[PDB]
Amino acid sequence: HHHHHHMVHITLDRNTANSWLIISKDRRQVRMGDTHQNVSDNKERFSNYPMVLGAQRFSSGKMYWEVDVTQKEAWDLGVCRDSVQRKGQFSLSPENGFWTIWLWQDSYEAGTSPQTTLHIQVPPCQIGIFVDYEAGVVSFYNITDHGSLIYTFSECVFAGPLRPFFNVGFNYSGGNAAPLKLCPL
């Protein structure tokens, strides 16, 4: 692809984080801690899942960023409305304000309702995310496989400002401790 010139510097918003997440000093990395991280609760924090939002809000234009997923077994990535539900159980779908893909149990799927099987020959170590607000597009790219297309959500109805969205996943197996990292431009 040729989206690299729309690169944006994303940082993580600590206030939105699940209380077990550990975000690095530079706000560019996040991982699952083995306990509560000693923060107060608030109405913004994701309660049920190890999720966090980027600080940046997008309401126009074209945006691109990259995320490192090396040696993770489970994660969700994409964008979401600023006003997505934070508390309780919910599914990642456009109806609920999410445009996401994920890895789970050795398969990759797009967060449609119901979910869509992805066809990935080269397991990605870094994912590129492109948003065209005006066109209503969210696209995902396999940076490990020379930028090959993973998935495009088109005819998106964003219906609000967008925020970068992350889920580091649970670590019940002991094999999913590794962080998500925002990759440098």
Residues at the contact surface with ligand LHR, assessed by CB under 6 A: 41-43, 47, 87
Q: Shortest approach of ligand LHR to residue 87 CB, angstroms?
A: 3
- Cβ-based nearer residue to ligand LHR, 40 or 105: 40
Measured distance CA(140)–CA(129) in Å, rounded:
5
- Cβ-based nearer residue to ligand LHR, 48 or 113: 48
Q: Shortest approach of ligand LHR to residue 18 CB, angstroms?
A: 12
- Cβ-based nearer residue to ligand LHR, 18 or 139: 18
Q: Shortest approach of ligand LHR to residue 45 CB, angstroms?
A: 8
Measured distance CA(8)–CA(139) in Å, rounded:
15
Measured distance CA(32)–CA(46) in Å, rounded:
13
Q: Shortest approach of ligand LHR to residue 39 CB, angstroms?
A: 11
- Cβ-based nearer residue to ligand LHR, 47 or 154: 47
Which H or E run contains 132? strand 126-132
Task: List, in sequence order, every residue forming a beta bridge with 132; answer none if it has no partner.
Answer: 62, 137
Q: What are phi and psi of 48, to 5 degrees?
A: -95, -20
Q: What are phi and psi of 119, to 5 degrees?
A: -115, 95
- Cβ-based nearer residue to ligand LHR, 42 or 173: 42
Q: Shortest approach of ligand LHR to residue 86 CB, angstroms?
A: 8
Residue-wise DSSP of 35-75: S--S----TTS--SSSEEEBS--BSSSEEEEEEE-TT-S-E
How wide is the angle at C-alpha 77 spanned by C-alphas 60 and 50, nearest 5°? 120
